[PDB]
Design a protein around this ligand. Structure first.
Ligand SMILES: [Zn+2]
Ligand SMILES: [Zn+2]
Lengths: 261, 258
């Protein structure tokens, strides 16, 4: 099953409510204004091809990078000069049928693409962090180079590399010039909407991470629907077998805002 | 995809505006006058092969040393005596379609080959640092010489070789004076052109590093287009309330002086 092909067929052939190619126009804007995210409505995908739609929301980790590669490929065929300005693109899914109430989150929701509908309580100022860099462990027994961070995600905290992935020991790490990339990042807290908070109880809260072009997408007081993979965050618990109570967070993949006046 | 081969094809077959082999002639001048840099116009590369052109500007750190090796190899076949005078050559790309205004630099520009068009404000006097070292493994079973680093130039700071690349064992390594080589370097500051500086505000500035034959390429007051990879410094940032966390600089790969 080649989901790459059906995705491109979807973008180029899907007809909207007015019999217009909704996603051809969204892609042209993206190209014309050098934006790097394409917003896709889940229901549009469902109507076009259900297998694709369910692949997107149930096999997200694996499928999304494949769709993003296909989109980038498609954009470069429309305008080869796009790669001068933008090196990678995001596919951001909105309106998925897995809206979960904060109060009802369960252990099986971890690792899934979910939506939380709540109120943004606070937001940190935008910071740049190292997205990818190469370091050398300056130590007689090692002197090896490694990429850092290992994966492509920063759970709530920003840092420099403290323990070496090659030899497992700390020490001095030299940044290798001209191999560093940066990304914008901020942390925010989303809170239960007042109508969901039972009388006599405090609102539940969730930490979220907004990266790249999702930074400054909303301000305190706004009502927001954030879609992302719910994940656990190792806040140095005594061991691994400590059941995580509040040590969850969401890396946001899409956001819809109802703006507070 | 063998970009080494396409690069040599480009240099030897590209036809200019007057149907002449522009880069054969530039290479001959380089050989005849013992220059060590070949200047390449981005638009020429784009016309010849777009994949190569975009590899050069988007995968610069990896691809450029490969192209420079291929060029050196090609020059030594034309004139083997060139190696008597010049040990290393530079491929310097000009006229790239990524001119960025200093005031508009963003975090995603870090790590990219960019061009800044500005005014040279300050330049330090030229100094010399070690760019290549040869060592001898002082051990009865070995006594062989080797370059270090292996297939790249020495970074700003020396790194002492601990394991021998010839025999795979540690020991005593003697630095060879006569095979250890120096490179000229200087630091400069480029500044926003007056026409870009808004009323009531100071010009933005950027620290740049000029090495080898790029040294003394311009003087204070000159308007310059510098192309290089925008990079961060590793240091104590101590940035109180700043959105930008890291100080930045450019190691210059090409310069045009208008
Ligand atoms: Zn190590
Ligand atoms: Zn040896």
């Amino acid at each position: 099953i080649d989901y790459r092909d059906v995705f491109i067929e979807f973008l180029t052939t899907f007809k909207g409510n007015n019999n217009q190619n909704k996603y051809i126009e969204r892609i042209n804007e993206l190209v014309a204004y050098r934006k790097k995210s394409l917003i896709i409505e889940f229901s549009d995908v469902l109507s076009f091809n259900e297998n694709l739609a369910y692949e997107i929301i149930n096999n997200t980790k694996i499928i999304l990078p494949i769709l993003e590669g296909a989109l980038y490929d498609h954009i470069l065929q429309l305008d080869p000069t796009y790669q001068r300005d933008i090196e990678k693109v995001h596919v951001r899914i909105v309106g998925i049928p897995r809206v979960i109430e904060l109060r009802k989150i369960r252990s099986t929701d971890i690792g899934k693409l979910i939506t939380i509908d709540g109120i943004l309580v606070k937001v940190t100022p935008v910071k740049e962090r190292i997205y990818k860099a190469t370091y050398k462990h300056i130590h007689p027994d090692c002197m090896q180079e490694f990429e850092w961070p290992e994966d492509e995600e920063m759970p709530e905290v920003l840092e420099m590399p403290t323990i070496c992935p090659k030899c497992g020991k700390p020490g001095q790490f030299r940044l290798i010039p001209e191999k560093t990339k940066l990304i914008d990042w901020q942390k925010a807290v989303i809170q239960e909407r007042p109508e969901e908070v039972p009388s006599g109880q405090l609102p539940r809260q969730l930490e979220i991470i907004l990266e790249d072009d999702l930074v400054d997408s909303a301000r305190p007081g706004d009502r927001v629907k954030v879609t992302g993979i719910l994940d656990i965050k190792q806040d140095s618990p005594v061991k691994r077998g400590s059941r995580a109570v509040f040590d969850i967070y969401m890396k946001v993949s899409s956001i819809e805002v109802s703006q507070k006046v």
